[PDB]
Amino acid sequence: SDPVRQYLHEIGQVPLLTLEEEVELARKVEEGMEAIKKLSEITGLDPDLIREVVRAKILGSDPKTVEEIDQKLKSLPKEHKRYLHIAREGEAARQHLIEANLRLVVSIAKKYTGRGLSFLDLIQEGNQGLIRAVEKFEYKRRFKFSTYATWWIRQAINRAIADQARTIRIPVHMVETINKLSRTARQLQQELGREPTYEEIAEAMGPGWDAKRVEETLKIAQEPVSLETPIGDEKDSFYGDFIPDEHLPSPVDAATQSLLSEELEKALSKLSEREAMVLKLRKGLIDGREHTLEEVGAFFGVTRERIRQIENKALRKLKYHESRTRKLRDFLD
Amino acid sequence: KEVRKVRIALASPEKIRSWSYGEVEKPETINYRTLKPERDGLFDERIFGPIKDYECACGKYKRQRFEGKVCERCGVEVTKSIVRRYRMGHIELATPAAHIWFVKDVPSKIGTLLDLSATELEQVLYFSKYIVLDPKGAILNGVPVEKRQLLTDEEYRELRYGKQETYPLPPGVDALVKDGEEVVKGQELAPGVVSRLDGVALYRFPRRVRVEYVKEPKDYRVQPHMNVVVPEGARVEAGDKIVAAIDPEEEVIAEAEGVVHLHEPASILVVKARVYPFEDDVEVSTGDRVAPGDVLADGGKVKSDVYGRVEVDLVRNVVRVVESYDIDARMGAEAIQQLLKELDLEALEKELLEEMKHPSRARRAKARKRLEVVRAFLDSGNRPEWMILEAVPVLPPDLRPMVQVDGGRFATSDLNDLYRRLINRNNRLKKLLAQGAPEIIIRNEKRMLQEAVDALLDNGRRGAPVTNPGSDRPLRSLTDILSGKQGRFRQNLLGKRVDYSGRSVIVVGPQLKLHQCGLPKRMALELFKPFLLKKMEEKGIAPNVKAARRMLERQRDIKDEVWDALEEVIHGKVVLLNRAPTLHRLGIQAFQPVLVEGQSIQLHPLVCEAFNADFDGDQMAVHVPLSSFAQAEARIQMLSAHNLLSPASGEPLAKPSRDIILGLYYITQVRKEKKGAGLEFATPEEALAAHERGEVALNAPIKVAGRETSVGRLKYVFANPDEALLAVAHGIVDLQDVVTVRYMGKRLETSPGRILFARIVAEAVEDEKVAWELIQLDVPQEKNSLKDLVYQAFLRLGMEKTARLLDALKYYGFTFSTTSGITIGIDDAVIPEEKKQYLEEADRKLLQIEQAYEMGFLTDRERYDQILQLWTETTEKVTQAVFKNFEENYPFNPLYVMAQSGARGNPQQIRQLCGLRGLMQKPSGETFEVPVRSSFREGLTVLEYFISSHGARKGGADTALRTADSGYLTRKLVDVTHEIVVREADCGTTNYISVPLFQPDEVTRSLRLRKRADIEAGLYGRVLAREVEVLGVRLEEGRYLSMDDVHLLIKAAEAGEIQEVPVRSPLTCQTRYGVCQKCYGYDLSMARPVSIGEAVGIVAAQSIGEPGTQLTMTQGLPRVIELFEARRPKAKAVISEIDGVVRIEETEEKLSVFVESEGFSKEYKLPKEARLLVKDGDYVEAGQPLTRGAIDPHQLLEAKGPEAVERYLVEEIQKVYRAQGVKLHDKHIEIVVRQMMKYVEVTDPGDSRLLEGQVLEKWDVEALNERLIAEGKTPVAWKPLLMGVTKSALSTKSWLSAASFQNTTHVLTEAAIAGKKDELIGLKENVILGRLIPAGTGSDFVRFTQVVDQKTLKAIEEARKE
DNA sequence: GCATCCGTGAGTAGAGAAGCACAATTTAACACTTTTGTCAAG
DNA sequence: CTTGACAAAAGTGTTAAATTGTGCTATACTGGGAGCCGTCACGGATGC
Ligand SMILES: [Mg+2]
Ligand SMILES: [Mg+2]
Ligand SMILES: [Zn+2]
Ligand SMILES: [Zn+2]
Structure with a gap:
């Protein structure tokens, strides 16, 4: 029932590496990676293609072509088959090197909890940085693995928080900007003994910052609120029960639109057969789209000035009719 | 087309x-800046639809002409933006995930199919244990591995990769064994360590290298940070590398030719492997898996002879094959999905049928559970592996909205x-798989993916x-949205908020008619606004x-002419008034x-x-029926003046109460005097002479010659009611004085008030003769008499x-109560003089x-019981003294009059005011041993008040x-009987x-006539199944039993002419x-045969449930609940399973009752x-x-049969309502009991496809038996x-009604697998779909x-047949 | 048979916590025609 | 009813700044954290 305890038990079955074992595994990965490069230069295929084929055999269990490429590599002579062996051992050493450092990520990941990601999310993201650490680690520098791996494990956790801890994703540059603003404000708060103002925070931030920018950054940093947040002691009301839907038209709005449509077509009946057609075509009352005097000059074969000539004349006659009946002004609001 | 069925199935x-x-x-x-949906996101317009109608995201198209x-x-x-409420997405899972409903809903559907327990299924699904799919010839602990076997992580690693362990050595020591030495279990690798397993021992990191040169040893x-490049015993030529290092300066090259000897290993790794030395190239590589007989290195010369994984050694120049098997064991839903894909339902059904013949009941029961699941998949066409998800559906974004509020902040649902x-977890798994991450990392990610699916x-x-983060509130998942009281079913489908509705505080409308209510104008303007706008335009x-x-x-812009138009709007229209809680249907009328x-x-x-409304702050909801159907239904079926009798009992529910009873009781009660009571005269003139002198009062009972009369009867003889009431108006006599009035051609000795009451009924019904038969003149009008008058007037x-x-x-009840002079003073609570005598006597x-x-x-308990019995009797005697004092001394006392008339108060409450609290x-x-000796008039003491506070709080x-x-x-009652509707005139049954x-009575051991109300x-109201002849009256078959017929049967029962009445009941209905x-x-609400189409099941549920709060709560409401829940009584009685003669054998140790029969000894x-x-000796029946x-x-x-338990349940439930005086007709209980006996259990399938122990409706098996008999096959x-x-x-x-009641996950899980098709028979199903209910x-x-009118009818007729 | 853990259910209304470097992608400011729309001319 | 020609409006192709995405830091660091609690009865299964 406890996924965290289950994971810790799983990583507890891989013993920690001694320094001699750490160097041997680190050496094999570098030798294996170099062996893959030598193989590709000779066999002519993609270096990335070969490492997947070598990795597939080590892991075990397109499968059609993996055997074909693996058989081709084994078809090489004795001198070239040797480089395949280091590639196999190097990939196997990489798997064991990663497995024996799964305790390091847990120690690092526990320092990042409470920042929007669960503990298991932090570990898995930290594992991704650990895998990248193995690829970029160099044992020639005689530095221990934990010294260099810690940088990549912390890097992967930080990037995941900046990318996955918010419902509305915010880029890393703005997340690091939001983090700086809070740190600066907190430092000003403890020194001034009160909540800093936006002018005070902007001045402490440095050049290019004013109270307007601080307020906009805080506005951006506002997390969305849950629609299922309860109100009151009783568990029978939420925020969503008090938020009206402003997208769908109301029955009143739908009705007055229909009322306007039938009164407008009734007024257009007084117009001529062609004069009413032009307005319905120019205003998009038929096709739904406003057409140009040109797009209308092709439907009827008339000049762009013909339309503008009558379209106004039909418009003027509706103005006279409206002033005589006044059955259309109330829709104007 | 019309929607007629709803089907649910697996996707x-x-x-x-x-x-x-x-x-x-x-x-x-x-986007955090534009606030517009992101591409490929949870709100993408390319997937779910445009945010606004007929407009693309880029903005190229903004018109309706481009639809589609x-x-x-x-x-x-380019389409309508409303498609975002319907268009769905999907998430392509990297690995399959099981649906939590088919895993955790006990019993597990997946586990039942796979014969896996809940613990076993939990371990595999959440990556704790492996399940074997292909053993590949693997052996564990000497036993070959079988399919579906569960393997722990340690066991799997031994089989998959092999057995090996490294043994560290103390610093500075040397290993006894050499590199590549076949050590055994317990053999000492070093002085301080022993190998716990047998295998090849090899050095890991030799700290010291000894090279014996050929010419002298050199210890390095x-x-x-250094690695030896040559093996132990290698022949190293002068200058060849021996130990490698990062820097060439530290490289240990040989000075001359010699042989390398490794020493001081860091640790010894003993691996259970076979070593195959080779000289030429190798035909395999590290990680390759070889079977016995597979060639390894030398082109056929070297071949493996054991299963294992190859690891080629480039320094030792050997090939080690770590003994292991290529066993196909997987974890998670992927392993479970493969098992269900390979599961043959047809083959499994045959095997389960064979196990159904096993003589063990448990084996048959277990096989039935599996075979019900198997047959559900076979009949519905559902495919069992669909219970594991590969693509996760994504809800449409408008159903999980992210909306900006008026403040500016965003609000989003928990589903997002x-x-x-x-x-996030699915994408990370894809990258982890692409990077070739170790199985431990992949295992955790897959486990987290399964939990992410479960949480959603x-x-x-x-x-x-x-x-x-930041709160402890659990996220609302899909299951939470649909289940519970706040779920979709109970909050938005079975009930909704409605338009054209209002709410306000209620006040008494004494001047209103029964069909009228006072509606505020401001409310009505809002309630009828759309109608008013039309009316305003017409004017x-x-x-x-x-x-x-x-x-x-x-x-301030509303003119007075608007209010006049509003009156024309509401003319003839009705509104619906509702007060919560709506315990019965008359909670909405x-x-x-009337605009007020x-x-x-x-x-x-x-x-x-x-x-159940009073005027101490109660509020009511107002609703406006809109269409002609809705208005016609309310004006005909729901009008208050059309609903006068209780549907639960048939008694008048709209009847005089409170002040109306009190006003009518005051004028109908007659005054009694005692000034000259019992004194006798000789002539009527002498009696009148005594009254003039004041010797005898007007209403004092006297005797003229031999007839008991009074002065008022002789002194005042009125020719008509008008003259009698004229004298009252002139003050000669009161309404309560008994006089002589000639009415209806009869010389009546009654009071003008009783005569006045007769005229009230006569003028109300506009029929003087019928009203005379409807009233009881010679009694004061109380609650029961007024209720009887209303019921009798309704029938006639x-x-x-x-x-x-x-x-x-x-009207008259309120009018007379005002002028009566009814008040409450402290002296009205008269303390009897007998209380002091009783308290001293006690x-x-x-x-x-x-x-x-x-x-x-x-003893102590005897003393405690004696005191309680003493005070209980003293309390009862004081209650009698309180009412006896009122009866003889204050017949018009306010508390006494209210209690006797039934307006307010009961004798228990009157005693607490005038006698003692108790x-x-x-x-x-x-x-408590000591009672509260003071009443409320005297005033309790501080201690007595606190003592009484425990009961009030309780x-x-x-x-x-x-x-x-x-x-x-x-x-529960509504949801089990909602489908019961009167659907036909007659089912044709003869049952x-x-x-x-009569009922048996234990105190006399005989049959005693039951109570009339019982x-x-x-x-009442029941159709006679058989013809009954009682008291010379022939009650034909099919006759509806009216109240007069019921009273006739009771009278015949008292004459010994009948003991039981054969009536038709829902229990025996075949509809x-x-x-x-x-x-x-x-x-019962109309006192006439029910109309076809009435939802009597809903009425029955409301009739039973409405008085539930009036029960005192084996007693009260808990007794009713266990009876309707068919729960086994805790203090269970013991009933004889067979008939015979009981034979008691009492002993000092135990008791044993033997029911002796002809050849049976129970x-x-x-x-x-x-x-x-x-x-002893009594003959007892079975049960x-x-x-x-x-x-x-x-x-x-099981002891007596279905009819016995049906009559027991109805009788026992009735007993509870009888104790509280609640009158409930037996029909309402029998409708519910009919639903409680609707299902049967198969004991012998016969020639059908049913299973022994299968539960199904009684109608279905009877219908199934009819077809089997019609073709000669064995019936079930x-x-x-x-x-x-x-x-x-x-x-x-119907799964729709069941899912909306309780156990929504359980109901939907079984319905979807079985592919159930809801036929929309009951009321709840059509309510959910917004359809017209079939009632x-x-x-x-x-x-x-x-x-149709005649003019139209003849026009159609004359135009067709011409 | 029995004892135990898990799952289910328990009234209705209303009111209420890293920088930094660099590349890669997008936005916004320009210019540009090119296009409708329009007021003279018959 | 056509010029017609003409300015505004709109479209469009560059180019710049701005915003956003990604990689990388080398002493050594290697199994978490919060809860933990006053209901009661009821199936139903799961084993004993
Ligand atoms: Mg009240
Ligand atoms: Mg007289
Ligand atoms: Zn578009
Ligand atoms: Zn029937």
Whole structure:
């Protein structure tokens, strides 16, 4: 029932590496990676293609072509088959090197909890940085693995928080900007003994910052609120029960639109057969789209000035009719 | 076409992808700057649809002419924005995940198919244990591995990779063994360590290298950053590298030629492997898996002879094959999905049928559970592997909205966070798989993916609920949205908020008619606004509707002509008034609204009882029926003046109460005097002479010669009621003085008030002769008499005249109560002089108990019981003294008059005011020894008030918990009987029940006539099944039993001419999905045969549930609940399983009752403290209770049969309502009991496809048997089953109603797998779909009725047949 | 048979916590025609 | 009813700044954290 305890038990079955074992595994990965490069230069295929084929055999269990490429590599002579062996051992050493450092990520990941990601999310993201650490680690520098791996494990956790801890994703540059603003404000708060103002925070931030920018950054940093947040002691009301839907038209709005449509077509009946057609075509009352005097000059074969000539004349006659009946002004609001 | 059925089934991964308009690949929702949806996110317009109508995301298209077109740039279809409420997405999972409903809903559907327990399924699904799919010839602990075997992580690693362990050495020591030495278990590798396993031992990191040169040894040191490149014993030529290092300076090259010897290993790794030395190239490589006989290195010369994984060694020049097997064992839903894909349902069914023949009952029962699941998949066409998800459906974004509020902040649903977690974990798994991450990392990610799917579907079902950071609130998952009281079914489908509705405080409308209510004008303007806008446009108030609405927006712009138009709007229309809680149907009634100034609704006094409404702050909801159907239904079926009788009992529910009774009682009660009572005269003139001198009072009972009369009867003889009332108006006589009045041609010796009451009824009904027969003149008008008058007027005159009579009684009742002079003073609570005598007498006997207690004549408990009995008797005597004092000395006392008339108060409450408060109970339930000797008039002491406070708090706490229990019981009753509708006139059955007119009584051991109210509750309104001849009257078969017929049967029962009445009942009705008109009888609310289409099941549930809070709560409401739940009574009585003669054998150790028969000897080991109700020699029937207590309904079913338990359940439930005076007709219980006996259990399948022990409806097996008999096959043998209302409701065919009641996950899980098709038979299903319910006007029996005038009819006729 | 853990259910209204470097992608400011729309001319 | 020609409006192609995405830091660091609690009865299964 406890996924965290289950994971810790799983990583507890891989013993920690001694320094001699750490160097041997680190050496094999570098030798294996170099062996893959030598193989590709000779066999002519993609270096990335070969490492997947070598990795597939080590892991075990397109499968059609993996055997074909693996058989081709084994078809090489004795001198070239040797480089395949280091590639196999190097990939196997990489798997064991990663497995024996799964305790390091847990120690690092526990320092990042409470920042929007669960503990298991932090570990898995930290594992991704650990895998990248193995690829970029160099044992020639005689530095221990934990010294260099810690940088990549912390890097992967930080990037995941900046990318996955918010419902509305915010880029890393703005997340690091939001983090700086809070740190600066907190430092000003403890020194001034009160909540800093936006002018005070902007001045402490440095050049290019004013109270307007601080307020906009805080506005951006506002997390969305849950629609299922309860109100009151009783568990029978939420925020969503008090938020009206402003997208769908109301029955009143739908009705007055229909009322306007039938009164407008009734007024257009007084117009001529062609004069009413032009307005319905120019205003998009038929096709739904406003057409140009040109797009209308092709439907009827008339000049762009013909339309503008009558379209106004039909418009003027509706103005006279409206002033005589006044059955259309109330829709104007 | 019309929707007639709703089918639920499992969704295949292909079907889920068919629903989706695109795959949601990113967890992004909207841009933080533009606030517009992100591409490939949870709100993408390219997947779910445009944000606004007919506009693409880019903006190229913004018109409706491009409907159906997808923009080439943005990729968004140009269509209506409402498609975002319907268009779904999907998430392509990297690995399959199991659906939590089919895993955790006990019993597990996946586990049942795979024969896996809950623990075994949990371990595999959540990556704790492997399950074997292909052993590949693997052996574990000497036993070969079998398919479906569960392997732990340690066991799998031994089989998959092999057995090996490294043994560290103490620093500075050397290993005894050499590199590549075949060590065994227990052999010492080093002085301080021993190898715990047998295998090849090899050095890991030799710290010291000894090279013996050929010409001298040279001992070197190996740093931890150095590696030896040559093996032990290698021939190293001069200058060849021996130990490698990062820097060439530290490289240890050989000085000359020699042989390398490794020493001081860091550790020894003993691996159970076979070593194959080689000289030429190798045909395999590290990681390759070889079987015995596979060539390894030398082109055929070297070949493996054991299963294992190859690891080529480039320094030792050997090939080591670590003994291991290529076993195919997987974890998670992927392994489970493969098992269900390879599971043959047809083969499994045959095997399970064979196990069904096993003689063990448990084996057959277990096989039935599996075979029900197997047959569900086979019949529905569902494919079992669909219970594991490959594509996760994504809810449409508008159903999980992210909306900006007026403040500016965004609000989003919890599903978006649940979806983001799944996508974040799914995307990370894809990258981890692409990077070739170790299995441990992949295992954790897959386990987290399964939990992410579980949280989205049902958060908190397994493990800790997922919560958002910063709060402990669990995220609302899909299951939470649909289930519970706040779920979709109970909050938005079975009930909704409605338009055209209002609410206000209610006040009494004394001047209103029964069909009228007072509706505020301001409310009515809002309630009828759309109608008012049309009316304003018809008049000259406004030019059009839009201008009319603007006028009403501002109060100060509303003209007075608007209010006149509002009156024309509401003319003839009715509104619906509702007060919560709506315990019965008269909680909603239709009234014609009368516009009144003010903000309060005026309510008629006579409908307050039906609403359970008073005027101490109560509020009511107002609703406007819109169409002609809705208005016609309210004006005809729901009008208050059309609903005068209670549907539960048939008694008048709209009847005089409170002041109306008191005013009518005051004028109808006669005054009694005592000035000259009992004195005798000789002539009437002498009697009048004494009255003149004041010797005798006007109403004092006297005797003239030999007849008992009074002065008023002789002094005042009135020729007509008008003259008698004229004298009252002139002050000669009072309304309560007994005089002589000639009325109806008869010389009546009554009071003018009684004569006045007769005229009230006569003028109300506009018939003087009938009204004379309807009233009881010679009695004071109290609650019961007035109720009888209303019921009798209803039968003889109908609703319309009864409504006028009710209004007339209300008017005069209120008028006379005002002028009566009825008040409450402190002296009105008269303290009898007998209270002091009783208290002193009780004190003297109290000392007797204490004196005897000190003498040892009685124990502590005997003293406690004696004191309680003493005070209980003293309390009762004071109650008699209080009412006796009122009866003889203050006949018109306010408290006495209110109690006798039935207006307010009961004798228990009157005693607490005028006598003594009485005994009080401690919080533990024990009664205090000392009672509260003071009444409320005298005033309690401080201690007495605190002592009485325990009971008051206990009663209030009981009331609060009883309402929840009563409301829960009502919902169970509704959900089990909602489908019961009167669907036909007659089902044609000849079966019936016999209502007993006599019951056994234990105190006399004989049959005693039952109470009249009890006989009426079981006989009123019922259709006679057989012809009955009683008292020379022939009651034909099919006759509806009226109240007169019931009274005739009771009179015949007292004459010994009849003992039981054969009547048709719902228990014996053969109608499918309901009852027939004949088997139901009267519509108690109309005192006439029920109309086809009435939802009597809903009425029955409300009738039973409405008085639930009035029960005192084995007693009260808990007794009712266990009876309807068919629960086994805790103090279960013991009933004889067979008939015979009981033979008691009492001993000092135990008790044993033997029911001796002709050849049967049954045994029952009754406890010592068992209250036996039978003696030796008595002949007992099967199922007869040997011991007192509640009978187990299920034991009675198997002992005596279905009819016995049905009559037991109805009788026992009735007993509870009888104790509280609640009158409930037996029909309502029998409808529920009919549903409790609806299912049966198969005992012998015969020649059918059913299973022994299978539960199905009684109708189905009877229908199935008819076809089997019609073709000569063996019919199915079955036995009756009894289940509670909860279980019966959850086993109904329709999954929509069952899912909306309880166990939504369980109901939907079984329905989807079985592919159930809801036929929309009951009321709840059509409510969910918003369809017309098949009851009332929606019933097919009346729904298709046409109406036409003669002119149109003849025109159609004359035009066709011409 | 029995004892135990898990799952289910328990009235209705209303009111209420890293920088930094650099590349890669997008936005916004320009210019540019090119296009409708329009007021003279018959 | 056509010029017609003409300015505004709109479209369009560059180019710049701005915003956003990604990689990388080398002493050594290697199994978490919060809860933990006053209901009661009821199936139903799961084993004993
Ligand atoms: Mg009240
Ligand atoms: Mg006289
Ligand atoms: Zn577009
Ligand atoms: Zn019937």
